């Protein structure tokens, strides 16, 4: 390409749009990013150039049985349907950028986005599209390229936005993101959520933006304690403690803020558990349900109705599926279902006990759901995420321990030959009793013959001892009892020291490794939380019922221009930075030296000719 | 590709650049001598 | 035959042999414990 500009575009020859139209087409079809940049640089009217026939030609230029060809075959480019299918059916530059992304022409796409219009929105949109494409890509290697390119855009999109955020905080943050996007309806952030753009959400500007939305109209600096005092003293809001008809406007502003809904919900949830335990431990009786038991049933029904609303208003199948995707919503569903079984079994005349049992387990599920609170605090959210990533180590420990328990448990039981030999007890002595030995419960008197009386129990040959433990077997052989004690020593060494310490080692390593990623993941999930509570009805679950019952242009042109200017400045700064890098100076310096060497040779020749003419 | 990569490394460019400078210095000396001889012949 | 070809293809794959072997090995242990804990007696086996 350098030759073409040096020779074909030395300036000694004019050019025409029709002259360059054919060359441009060839470069696009042949993936020549440098040339297309050069040709456009030479005053080419792209808008007047592009034609639907040409656009069809480009798509037709897909490589052999490329994934895109499969989509086109399944789908006159008809691109719009393809995207609508890929997403889920929920200015020439934009079109070219879209085309480049589909064919994975990284440089072509990178260049077009640079010339694009909705730089930040386009960047994320590209990141979404590639990741979906890569996920669906069967080549298993092109996916790697698509994944790499997606990261490049996300990294570029966040880099651009940071510049915009610094320049004009209110302008960028509010209008540039909260607005509806282009080529889509879900706000720009939702595109990031779909793309799982961890890095983008990790940016300071968005985090500040989300925090602002999290607190709603209240100032984001409001102390937490101040909020709590206001919550328990509703009249207290009107004082100068909280920084932001007028009275009604402020009232809704305070009680509509996502944070206040969250805290109000949490307080209600705690009371629910407290009520649950009160019913479960005391008020639960075979007799027909009492007042409280009824209140709990009604309260739980409110939770069920609430969770139903979430899923119903997360494309019935589509929204149902995505709602089911959230882990917490899964926890809620399993919690409620068990509750229904408990009540159902509770009412039936003959299953009172089974009803209580399942409820007790059900209460355990609800309490575990309470960990969702820790996902809010910035110092705990990352911790909860990291815990999720430790399950790999725990499963290793369990399988390793499970093998050892079976190995030791069976061997010990075999040596003892206890006379009870009842299958439930056999399992107790094989798995249960050895398991507790990990935690300091070592029944020596049930295994060491030296600590047990000697008595005649069975006519079978050999000696026997009578352990005092109730579930230790009526009489255990003592043929090779020293071996039993020896295994106990080995078991404690392995299980109680090596494995437990090994597990601690794995946690220490895993925690250090995934600390960085976990932090980004939480920051990303922070948005999903805020959106969830943003739309939740104001009232709390026990009273949420009423809310359910009650439920039943030129500025944009100015904004876009503002975005483009910063993008252009950002690229120029980056491009200039590259030109000022040491390596580039070294390259340019060397080239100049060669030019100097060239002129020196010409000068040397000139001197020789002059010397000859000196005669 | 590996060999070309090496030749395009900064250190190699620096080496080649320095060598070219010496060549330029050499020709400069020859040119300087040529000017002196021509100046003498100017009489 | 195509059906036979597929049958051997599935049952000849190294992974399936591994899993089939593992299932057999587990049953072996389960049988072993059953013999060791209960069926083992001084009388003839
Ligand atoms: Ca929920």
State whether A353 and A500 are in the same domain. no
Tokens of A422: 């009842």
Residue A81 domain-assigned (yes or no): no
Q: Is A464 helix (H, G, I), strand (E, B) or coil?
A: strand
Q: What is the dihedral of CA B5, B10, B12, B15, to 10 degrees?
A: 170
Closest Cα in chain A to B23 = A597
β-strands A476-477, A453-454: how paired?
unpaired
Tokens of A465: 């001892």
Please give, one letter per residue, the 3-state secondary structure of A35-55.
HHHHHHHCCCCHHHHCCHHHH
Annotated binding site of A: 16, 43, 307, 310, 329, 332
What is the rounded CA–CA span in Å between residue A290 and residue A278? 12
Q: Phi/psi of residue A465, each to 5°?
A: -135, 155
- Which of A529, A523, A528, A531 is closest to A198 using CA atoms? A523
φ/ψ bin of A63: left (φ > 0), alpha (ψ from -120 to 50), beta (otherwise): beta
Q: CA angle A588-A591-A594, nearest 5°? A: 155
State whether A54 and A171 are in the same domain. no
State whether A302 and A444 are in the same domain. no
What is the rounded CA–CA span in Å between residue A604 and residue A596? 12
State whether A244 and A261 are in the same domain. no
What is the rounded CA–CA span in Å between residue A476 and residue A465? 6
What is the rounded CA–CA span in Å between residue A171 and residue A558? 11
Residue A261 domain-assigned (yes or no): yes
Residue A159 domain-assigned (yes or no): yes
Question: In chain A, how many domains are there?
Answer: 5
What is the rounded CA–CA span in Å between residue B20 and residue A597? 7
Examine chains A and C and say if they touch (3+ CB pairs below 8 A).
Answer: yes
Residue A37 domain-assigned (yes or no): yes
- Whether the CB-CB separation of A164 and A180 falls below 8 Å is answered with no
Q: What residues sit around ligand 1, an ion, with C-beta below 5 angstroms?
A: A 310, 329, 332
Tell me the count of A-B CB pairs closer than 8 A.
Answer: 44
b/e per residue A215-250 (b: at least 16 CB within 10 A): bbebeeebeeebbeebbeeeeebeeeebeeeeeeee
How many Å lie between the alpha carbon of A475 and the closest alpha carbon of chain C?
Answer: 15
b/e per residue A348-358 (b: at least 16 CB within 10 A): eeebbeebbeb
Using CB atoms within 10 A of its CB, is residue A308 exposed (0-12), middle (13-18) or buried (19+)?
Answer: middle
State whether A312 and A338 are in the same domain. yes
What is the rounded CA–CA span in Å between residue A574 and residue A580? 10
Residue A85 domain-assigned (yes or no): no
- Which of A49, A78, A155 is closest to A110 using CA atoms? A155
State whether A3 and A98 are in the same domain. no
Q: Is A466 helix (H, G, I), strand (E, B) or coil?
A: strand
Please give, one letter per residue, the 3-state secondary structure of A312-326.
HCCCHHHHHHHHHHC
Residue A80 domain-assigned (yes or no): no
Task: List chain A residues with CB under 8 Å of C36.
Answer: 410, 414
Task: List chain B residues with CB under 8 Å of A608.
Answer: 34
State whether A217 and A262 are in the same domain. no
Q: Do C37 and A426 touch (CB under 8 A)?
A: yes
State whether A333 and A418 are in the same domain. no
- Whether the CB-CB separation of A191 and A121 falls below 8 Å is answered with yes
Experimental method: cryo-EM
State whether A383 and A280 are in the same domain. yes
Asked which of A27, A45, A75 is the last residue of a domain, the reply is A75
State the resolution, in angstroms. 3.4
State whether A530 and A566 are in the same domain. no
What is the extent of the structural domain holding A593?
A: 553-615
What is the rounded CA–CA span in Å between residue C20 and residue C27? 11
- Whether the CB-CB separation of A139 and A67 falls below 8 Å is answered with yes
Closest Cα in chain C to A410 = C33
- For chain A, the residues before each gap (C–N > 2.5 Å) are 75, 90, 244, 314, 552
State whether A118 and A243 are in the same domain. yes
Residue A313 domain-assigned (yes or no): yes
Q: Do C33 and A460 touch (CB under 8 A)?
A: no
> How many residues appear in chain C?
45
Q: Do A410 and C42 touch (CB under 8 A)?
A: no
Annotated binding site of A for Ca(2+): 307, 310, 329, 332
What is the rounded CA–CA span in Å between residue A582 and residue A565? 28
Residue A83 domain-assigned (yes or no): no
State whether A401 and A464 are in the same domain. yes
């Amino acid at each position: 390409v350098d030759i073409a500009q040096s020779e074909l575009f030395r300036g000694d020859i004019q050019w025409r749009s029709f002259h360059l139209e054919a060359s441009l087409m060839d470069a696009l079809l042949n993936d020549r990013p440098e040339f297309v940049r050069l040709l456009i640089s030479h005053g080419l009217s792209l808008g007047h150039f592009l034609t639907p026939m040409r656009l069809a030609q480009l798509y037709s230029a897909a490589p052999s049985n490329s994934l895109i060809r499969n989509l086109l075959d399944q789908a006159p480019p008809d691109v719009g349907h393809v995207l609508r299918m890929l997403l889920g059916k929920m200015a020439p530059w934009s079109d070219l950028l879209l085309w480049a992304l589909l064919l994975n022409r990284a440089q072509m796409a990178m260049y077009f986005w640079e010339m694009g219009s909705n730089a930040v929105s386009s960047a994320l949109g590209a990141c979404l599209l590639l990741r979906v494409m890569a996920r669906l890509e069967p080549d298993a290697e092109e996916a790697a390229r698509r994944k790499d390119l997606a990261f490049k855009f996300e990294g570029m999109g966040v880099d651009l936005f940071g510049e915009c955020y610094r320049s004009s905080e209110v302008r960028a943050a509010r209008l540039l993101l909260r607005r509806c996007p282009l080529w889509g309806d879900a706000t720009c952030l939702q595109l990031a959520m779909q793309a799982d753009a961890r890095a983008f959400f990790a940016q300071d500007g968005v985090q500040s933006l989300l925090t602002q939305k999290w607190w709603g109209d209240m100032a984001s600096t409001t102390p937490i304690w101040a909020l709590v005092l206001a919550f328990f003293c509703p009249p207290l809001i009107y004082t100068r403690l909280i920084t932001f008809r007028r009275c009604l406007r402020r009232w809704f502003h305070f009680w509509g803020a996502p944070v206040t809904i969250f805290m109000g919900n949490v307080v209600s949830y705690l009371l629910f558990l407290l009520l649950f335990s009160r019913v479960l431990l005391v008020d639960f009786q075979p007799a027909p349900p009492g007042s409280l038991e009824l209140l709990l049933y009604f309260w739980a029904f409110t939770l069920l109705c609430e969770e139903l609303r979430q899923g119903l208003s997360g494309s019935l199948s589509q929204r149902l599926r995505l709602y089911l995707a959230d882990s917490w919503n899964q926890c809620d569903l399993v919690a409620l279902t068990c509750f229904l079984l408990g009540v159902g079994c509770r009412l039936t005349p003959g299953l009172y006990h089974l009803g209580r049992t399942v409820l007790c387990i059900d209460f355990m599920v609800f309490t575990v759901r309470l960990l969702h609170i820790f996902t809010v605090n910035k110092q705990l959210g990352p911790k909860i995420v990291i815990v999720s990533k430790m399950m790999k180590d725990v499963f290793f420990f369990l399988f390793f321990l499970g093998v050892w328990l079976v190995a030791y448990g069976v061997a010990t039981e075999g040596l003892l030959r206890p006379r009870d030999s009842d299958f439930p007890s056999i399992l107790r002595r094989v798995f249960y009793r050895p398991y507790l030995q990990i935690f300091g419960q070592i029944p020596q008197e049930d295994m060491d013959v030296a600590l047990m009386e000697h008595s005649n129990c069975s006519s079978e040959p050999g000696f026997w001892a009578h352990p005092p433990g109730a579930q230790a077997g009526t009489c255990v052989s003592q043929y090779a009892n020293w071996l039993v004690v020896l295994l106990l020593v080995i078991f404690l060494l392995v299980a109680n020291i090596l494995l437990v310490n090994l597990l601690i080692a794995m946690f220490s390593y895993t925690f250090g490794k995934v600390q960085g990623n976990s932090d980004l993941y939480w920051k990303a999930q922070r948005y999903r939380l805020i959106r969830e509570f943003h739309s939740r009805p104001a009232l709390a679950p026990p009273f949420i019922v009423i809310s359910h019952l009650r439920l039943l242009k030129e500025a944009e042109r100015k904004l876009l221009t503002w975005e483009s200017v910063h993008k252009e400045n950002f690229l120029l700064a980056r491009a200039r930075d590259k030109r000022e890098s040491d390596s580039e100076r070294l390259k340019r310096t060397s080239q100049k030296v060669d030019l100097a060497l060239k002129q020196l040779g010409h000068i040397r020749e000139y001197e020789q000719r002059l010397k000859v003419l000196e005669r």
